[PDB]
Amino acid sequence: HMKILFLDQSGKPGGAELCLIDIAKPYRDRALVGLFADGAFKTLLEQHHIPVEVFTNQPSLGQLAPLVAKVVQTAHEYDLIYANTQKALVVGAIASFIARRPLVYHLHDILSPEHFSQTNLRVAVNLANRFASLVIANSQASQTAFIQAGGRAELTKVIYNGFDINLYKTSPSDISKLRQQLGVANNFVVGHFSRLSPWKGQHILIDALAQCPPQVTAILVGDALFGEQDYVKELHQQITRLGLENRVKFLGFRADIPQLMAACDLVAHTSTAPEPFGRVIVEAMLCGKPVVAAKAGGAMELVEHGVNGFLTTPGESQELANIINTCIEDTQKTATIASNAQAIASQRFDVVTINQQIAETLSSL
Amino acid sequence: MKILFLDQSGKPGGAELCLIDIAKPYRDRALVGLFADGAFKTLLEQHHIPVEVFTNQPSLGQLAPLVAKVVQTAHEYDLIYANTQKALVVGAIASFIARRPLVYHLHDILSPEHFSQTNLRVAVNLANRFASLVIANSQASQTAFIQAGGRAELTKVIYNGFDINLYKTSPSDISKLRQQLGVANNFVVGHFSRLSPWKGQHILIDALAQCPPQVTAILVGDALFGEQDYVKELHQQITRLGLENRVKFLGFRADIPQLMAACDLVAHTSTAPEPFGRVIVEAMLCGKPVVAAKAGGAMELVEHGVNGFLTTPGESQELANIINTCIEDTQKTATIASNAQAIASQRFDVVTINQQIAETLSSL
Ligand SMILES: O=c1ccn([C@@H]2O[C@H](COP(=O)(O)OP(=O)(O)O)[C@@H](O)[C@H]2O)c(=O)[nH]1
């Protein structure tokens, strides 16, 4: 009976947008996702039969502020506004006071003065504080940065991203055949699953690969973000510099991530800036793979070092080489760790459990 | 204290003209923001009141440019003073984001007969939640705000103010102006507004027909593009009743105080309730008898028989009765008119009104 108006600024399927697919699904017969840009995320939502619409600035409030006005008027036939990004929060907060509907802010970013303008930090935080009935944080790191930026602590609740655990299971044979098709059957494959961007640190994996035995190869899965083509150029040159051209594959964007992860021997998350929540980390754990992650942000809540994956100082390529080598030398311990990771991640990040937490939290408003 | 005034209109309506008086004592530390260019902008410039037009051309900068520019500007000021409905909507948004107190100066009767229920709900909700203070230009405005669901405890009535001494005209200018208009020997009923059906000129004209031949009327004001059918209807009405030599259209005039003084009665005959009859007060300050339609703000401005006359809206025979009373009891009439000047100078002196505003702002 509760109808939700979800709002997301981006027309591109980023992590938060992908998360929103899962959040919205149980509500598809009683929800709408309003976007502020068209794009492939719109396609996806349509694929999932999640009602979706694009809200633009195209022409009393109607003329003063078209976007806000459209949101306000849509909000009238909904019971709650669920804002999924920063700009959606700003617009959602205004819409909430005008349309007289409760607001939920789902926080997916680390609200950091280094990646957000102090302008937007103050505005986002103050709007949340005064108008959000609840701020869902995707991790404790996201939670504390919100608080540190002046966010009200008592408004927050941590709810992790949820995953359909059975999608991450692949047979040994499918693994073998895919590895052959990738020509890595006799390699130690380290997989990196991220859009190519400097803060994702693919260059760190490349430097580590320089200090690894020759059987170690890398697969970079993900396409280049608009404006990062300098970075992608730096990588190719970095690689050629190091003679690694035949030991690194750029697969570009891939939708078959679980299968590709299953073909790897280790999954590496090498971000140089604190990660709010690494989806790829949890995905790798669900695939039953050893995982190594930079020791900042949400990654520290996802992995316990030595138990269900490995943590390394961000930007330190040698430390990453050492974990890679330890995985190569300590076969048994590594398999155990990887098995632990599948069990713990299934318990913690099952979409069924996450959807229950979301439902409970929403109903308690 | 620096004040950011906001007003939706580029045209100098009553609210906009009132804002000139309001802003003058603060003009070295204020800005008026308009949501459209026009003559009002020119008038502000004439008075050295800093002015600026905010538009929607280009993170809120992209999402809502107009709002974003107001917010941004508002950071430089200590208070946002919204003078109209739309300025309230925008100003409330800007008020929390920039973190500045907001005042709403309500110049309108928020009637569900002249505003859609959404604009009423939105204005009332925003004011109730974000206004530190709602200034109403009259008890009529105040009570309509509250009947729409406005928070009564937020309201204070502050009337429009006038420069008292502008409404004083010598008997020699009066005689000379009556001579030039050719009304020296007439009982002159003046009507001072633009030609519009809601302003009720046709009412005065029907009353003229129930009046002795020495009663003439002067209609002072021009016509709007939109009310051209009305103008022709007036001329036809005048010819049909045989009043063509007892009505003079003077067109638009800047010397209103002087023309009021040349009248013997000033007639306010609007057909719809108004928040605050500027013309009624001006007639009082000119020391003239004034008859007004008994609705809206008029009712607060006049005590019937004491300092002017109130007549049922739309009723020309009542109006004619008043006009004939003025002709027959000249002494009672001159006393009423003298009473009018004294009470209006007391209640609507801009010096006093400015003090009420200043006091009211300092309590925030
Ligand atoms: O080629 C790719 C690369 C990534 N992803 C997905 O994109 C999301 C990236 O999320 P993450 O939280 O790891 O990155 P962020 O968006 O925080 O930078 C994950 O679900 C990945 O499985 C994908 O579908 N195809």
PDB file of C-alpha atoms in Angstrom, chain A residues 184-325:
ATOM      1  CA  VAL A 184      44.724 -18.060 -18.918  1.00  0.00           C
ATOM      2  CA  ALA A 185      44.183 -21.734 -18.098  1.00  0.00           C
ATOM      3  CA  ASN A 186      47.755 -22.130 -16.895  1.00  0.00           C
ATOM      4  CA  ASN A 187      47.987 -18.714 -15.277  1.00  0.00           C
ATOM      5  CA  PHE A 188      47.449 -17.281 -11.868  1.00  0.00           C
ATOM      6  CA  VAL A 189      44.701 -14.765 -12.760  1.00  0.00           C
ATOM      7  CA  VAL A 190      44.088 -11.700 -10.671  1.00  0.00           C
ATOM      8  CA  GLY A 191      40.784 -10.045 -11.599  1.00  0.00           C
ATOM      9  CA  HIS A 192      40.020  -6.354 -11.271  1.00  0.00           C
ATOM     10  CA  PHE A 193      36.384  -5.419 -11.668  1.00  0.00           C
ATOM     11  CA  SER A 194      35.871  -1.700 -11.870  1.00  0.00           C
ATOM     12  CA  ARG A 195      35.360   1.142 -14.267  1.00  0.00           C
ATOM     13  CA  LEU A 196      38.783   2.482 -15.255  1.00  0.00           C
ATOM     14  CA  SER A 197      39.442   5.499 -13.110  1.00  0.00           C
ATOM     15  CA  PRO A 198      42.525   6.702 -11.181  1.00  0.00           C
ATOM     16  CA  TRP A 199      40.834   6.408  -7.801  1.00  0.00           C
ATOM     17  CA  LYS A 200      40.082   2.720  -8.653  1.00  0.00           C
ATOM     18  CA  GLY A 201      43.829   2.093  -8.751  1.00  0.00           C
ATOM     19  CA  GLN A 202      44.190  -0.298 -11.653  1.00  0.00           C
ATOM     20  CA  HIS A 203      47.689   1.125 -11.997  1.00  0.00           C
ATOM     21  CA  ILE A 204      48.511  -0.286  -8.509  1.00  0.00           C
ATOM     22  CA  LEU A 205      47.601  -3.782  -9.673  1.00  0.00           C
ATOM     23  CA  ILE A 206      49.746  -3.243 -12.771  1.00  0.00           C
ATOM     24  CA  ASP A 207      52.776  -2.186 -10.630  1.00  0.00           C
ATOM     25  CA  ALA A 208      52.252  -5.201  -8.361  1.00  0.00           C
ATOM     26  CA  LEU A 209      52.089  -7.486 -11.389  1.00  0.00           C
ATOM     27  CA  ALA A 210      55.683  -6.325 -12.107  1.00  0.00           C
ATOM     28  CA  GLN A 211      56.774  -7.931  -8.844  1.00  0.00           C
ATOM     29  CA  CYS A 212      54.938 -11.185  -9.374  1.00  0.00           C
ATOM     30  CA  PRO A 213      56.064 -14.484 -10.833  1.00  0.00           C
ATOM     31  CA  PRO A 214      55.602 -14.663 -14.606  1.00  0.00           C
ATOM     32  CA  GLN A 215      52.544 -16.959 -14.463  1.00  0.00           C
ATOM     33  CA  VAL A 216      50.523 -14.110 -12.905  1.00  0.00           C
ATOM     34  CA  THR A 217      48.188 -12.313 -15.271  1.00  0.00           C
ATOM     35  CA  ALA A 218      45.520  -9.706 -14.816  1.00  0.00           C
ATOM     36  CA  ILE A 219      42.122  -9.041 -16.255  1.00  0.00           C
ATOM     37  CA  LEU A 220      40.709  -5.526 -16.115  1.00  0.00           C
ATOM     38  CA  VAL A 221      36.989  -5.718 -16.401  1.00  0.00           C
ATOM     39  CA  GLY A 222      35.120  -2.450 -16.867  1.00  0.00           C
ATOM     40  CA  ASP A 223      34.941   0.372 -19.410  1.00  0.00           C
ATOM     41  CA  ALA A 224      36.502   3.817 -19.238  1.00  0.00           C
ATOM     42  CA  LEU A 225      34.586   6.591 -17.530  1.00  0.00           C
ATOM     43  CA  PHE A 226      33.840   9.764 -19.557  1.00  0.00           C
ATOM     44  CA  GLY A 227      36.869  11.989 -18.944  1.00  0.00           C
ATOM     45  CA  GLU A 228      39.320   9.300 -17.814  1.00  0.00           C
ATOM     46  CA  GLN A 229      40.852   8.498 -21.233  1.00  0.00           C
ATOM     47  CA  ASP A 230      44.089  10.116 -20.058  1.00  0.00           C
ATOM     48  CA  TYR A 231      44.154   7.503 -17.308  1.00  0.00           C
ATOM     49  CA  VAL A 232      43.451   4.603 -19.650  1.00  0.00           C
ATOM     50  CA  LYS A 233      46.291   5.948 -21.777  1.00  0.00           C
ATOM     51  CA  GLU A 234      48.620   6.096 -18.751  1.00  0.00           C
ATOM     52  CA  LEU A 235      47.844   2.418 -18.052  1.00  0.00           C
ATOM     53  CA  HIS A 236      48.613   1.181 -21.530  1.00  0.00           C
ATOM     54  CA  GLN A 237      51.914   3.032 -21.362  1.00  0.00           C
ATOM     55  CA  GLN A 238      52.608   1.875 -17.845  1.00  0.00           C
ATOM     56  CA  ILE A 239      51.970  -1.669 -19.080  1.00  0.00           C
ATOM     57  CA  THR A 240      54.145  -1.342 -22.250  1.00  0.00           C
ATOM     58  CA  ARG A 241      56.830   0.238 -20.096  1.00  0.00           C
ATOM     59  CA  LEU A 242      56.832  -2.937 -17.917  1.00  0.00           C
ATOM     60  CA  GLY A 243      56.533  -5.529 -20.702  1.00  0.00           C
ATOM     61  CA  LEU A 244      53.182  -6.623 -19.270  1.00  0.00           C
ATOM     62  CA  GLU A 245      51.253  -6.263 -22.517  1.00  0.00           C
ATOM     63  CA  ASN A 246      50.571  -9.996 -22.790  1.00  0.00           C
ATOM     64  CA  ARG A 247      49.821 -10.457 -19.090  1.00  0.00           C
ATOM     65  CA  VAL A 248      46.977  -7.859 -18.819  1.00  0.00           C
ATOM     66  CA  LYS A 249      43.583  -8.050 -20.605  1.00  0.00           C
ATOM     67  CA  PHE A 250      41.163  -5.144 -20.937  1.00  0.00           C
ATOM     68  CA  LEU A 251      37.868  -6.897 -21.399  1.00  0.00           C
ATOM     69  CA  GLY A 252      35.926  -3.651 -21.337  1.00  0.00           C
ATOM     70  CA  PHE A 253      32.449  -3.641 -19.883  1.00  0.00           C
ATOM     71  CA  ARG A 254      31.054  -7.023 -18.977  1.00  0.00           C
ATOM     72  CA  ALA A 255      27.651  -8.101 -17.621  1.00  0.00           C
ATOM     73  CA  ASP A 256      28.822 -11.660 -16.917  1.00  0.00           C
ATOM     74  CA  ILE A 257      30.803 -10.659 -13.796  1.00  0.00           C
ATOM     75  CA  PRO A 258      30.176 -13.749 -11.581  1.00  0.00           C
ATOM     76  CA  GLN A 259      31.422 -16.045 -14.384  1.00  0.00           C
ATOM     77  CA  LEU A 260      34.501 -13.939 -15.025  1.00  0.00           C
ATOM     78  CA  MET A 261      35.238 -13.769 -11.273  1.00  0.00           C
ATOM     79  CA  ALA A 262      34.965 -17.583 -11.081  1.00  0.00           C
ATOM     80  CA  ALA A 263      37.615 -17.793 -13.802  1.00  0.00           C
ATOM     81  CA  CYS A 264      39.997 -15.795 -11.590  1.00  0.00           C
ATOM     82  CA  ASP A 265      42.294 -17.045  -8.825  1.00  0.00           C
ATOM     83  CA  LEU A 266      42.205 -13.849  -6.812  1.00  0.00           C
ATOM     84  CA  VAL A 267      39.944 -10.720  -7.083  1.00  0.00           C
ATOM     85  CA  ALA A 268      41.742  -7.462  -6.341  1.00  0.00           C
ATOM     86  CA  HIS A 269      40.176  -4.220  -5.156  1.00  0.00           C
ATOM     87  CA  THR A 270      42.935  -1.585  -5.159  1.00  0.00           C
ATOM     88  CA  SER A 271      41.196   1.752  -4.637  1.00  0.00           C
ATOM     89  CA  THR A 272      43.417   4.705  -3.773  1.00  0.00           C
ATOM     90  CA  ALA A 273      40.570   6.703  -2.222  1.00  0.00           C
ATOM     91  CA  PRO A 274      38.316   5.301   0.590  1.00  0.00           C
ATOM     92  CA  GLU A 275      35.494   3.145  -0.850  1.00  0.00           C
ATOM     93  CA  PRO A 276      31.983   3.606   0.655  1.00  0.00           C
ATOM     94  CA  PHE A 277      31.140  -0.095  -0.012  1.00  0.00           C
ATOM     95  CA  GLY A 278      32.938  -2.231  -2.585  1.00  0.00           C
ATOM     96  CA  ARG A 279      30.196  -4.225  -4.350  1.00  0.00           C
ATOM     97  CA  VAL A 280      32.903  -6.143  -6.246  1.00  0.00           C
ATOM     98  CA  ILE A 281      34.473  -7.196  -2.975  1.00  0.00           C
ATOM     99  CA  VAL A 282      31.232  -8.824  -1.763  1.00  0.00           C
ATOM    100  CA  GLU A 283      30.611 -10.238  -5.235  1.00  0.00           C
ATOM    101  CA  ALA A 284      34.020 -11.917  -5.163  1.00  0.00           C
ATOM    102  CA  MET A 285      33.342 -13.351  -1.693  1.00  0.00           C
ATOM    103  CA  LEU A 286      30.002 -14.741  -2.945  1.00  0.00           C
ATOM    104  CA  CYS A 287      31.891 -16.399  -5.821  1.00  0.00           C
ATOM    105  CA  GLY A 288      33.994 -18.215  -3.262  1.00  0.00           C
ATOM    106  CA  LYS A 289      37.179 -16.363  -4.324  1.00  0.00           C
ATOM    107  CA  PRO A 290      40.054 -15.082  -2.329  1.00  0.00           C
ATOM    108  CA  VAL A 291      39.806 -11.297  -2.270  1.00  0.00           C
ATOM    109  CA  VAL A 292      42.321  -8.527  -1.479  1.00  0.00           C
ATOM    110  CA  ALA A 293      41.129  -5.013  -0.815  1.00  0.00           C
ATOM    111  CA  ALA A 294      42.530  -1.635   0.051  1.00  0.00           C
ATOM    112  CA  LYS A 295      42.357  -0.991   3.777  1.00  0.00           C
ATOM    113  CA  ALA A 296      40.123   2.077   3.819  1.00  0.00           C
ATOM    114  CA  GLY A 297      36.394   2.883   3.823  1.00  0.00           C
ATOM    115  CA  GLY A 298      33.782   0.115   3.790  1.00  0.00           C
ATOM    116  CA  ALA A 299      36.298  -2.530   2.678  1.00  0.00           C
ATOM    117  CA  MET A 300      37.518  -2.738   6.223  1.00  0.00           C
ATOM    118  CA  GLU A 301      33.986  -3.720   7.346  1.00  0.00           C
ATOM    119  CA  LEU A 302      33.660  -6.294   4.575  1.00  0.00           C
ATOM    120  CA  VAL A 303      36.896  -8.257   5.079  1.00  0.00           C
ATOM    121  CA  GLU A 304      38.559  -9.501   8.214  1.00  0.00           C
ATOM    122  CA  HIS A 305      42.228  -9.859   7.348  1.00  0.00           C
ATOM    123  CA  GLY A 306      43.305 -13.488   7.053  1.00  0.00           C
ATOM    124  CA  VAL A 307      39.812 -14.844   7.781  1.00  0.00           C
ATOM    125  CA  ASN A 308      37.756 -14.147   4.676  1.00  0.00           C
ATOM    126  CA  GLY A 309      40.082 -12.088   2.521  1.00  0.00           C
ATOM    127  CA  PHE A 310      43.113  -9.790   2.706  1.00  0.00           C
ATOM    128  CA  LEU A 311      43.553  -6.061   3.396  1.00  0.00           C
ATOM    129  CA  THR A 312      46.508  -3.971   2.138  1.00  0.00           C
ATOM    130  CA  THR A 313      47.512  -0.380   2.525  1.00  0.00           C
ATOM    131  CA  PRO A 314      45.970   1.603  -0.287  1.00  0.00           C
ATOM    132  CA  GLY A 315      48.343   2.566  -3.129  1.00  0.00           C
ATOM    133  CA  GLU A 316      51.095   0.130  -1.940  1.00  0.00           C
ATOM    134  CA  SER A 317      51.881  -2.115  -4.917  1.00  0.00           C
ATOM    135  CA  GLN A 318      54.523  -4.270  -3.089  1.00  0.00           C
ATOM    136  CA  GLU A 319      52.131  -5.114  -0.272  1.00  0.00           C
ATOM    137  CA  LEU A 320      49.673  -6.224  -2.983  1.00  0.00           C
ATOM    138  CA  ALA A 321      52.373  -8.346  -4.647  1.00  0.00           C
ATOM    139  CA  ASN A 322      53.016 -10.040  -1.300  1.00  0.00           C
ATOM    140  CA  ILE A 323      49.378 -11.099  -0.897  1.00  0.00           C
ATOM    141  CA  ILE A 324      49.345 -12.314  -4.500  1.00  0.00           C
ATOM    142  CA  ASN A 325      52.438 -14.408  -3.755  1.00  0.00           C
TER     143      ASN A 325
END
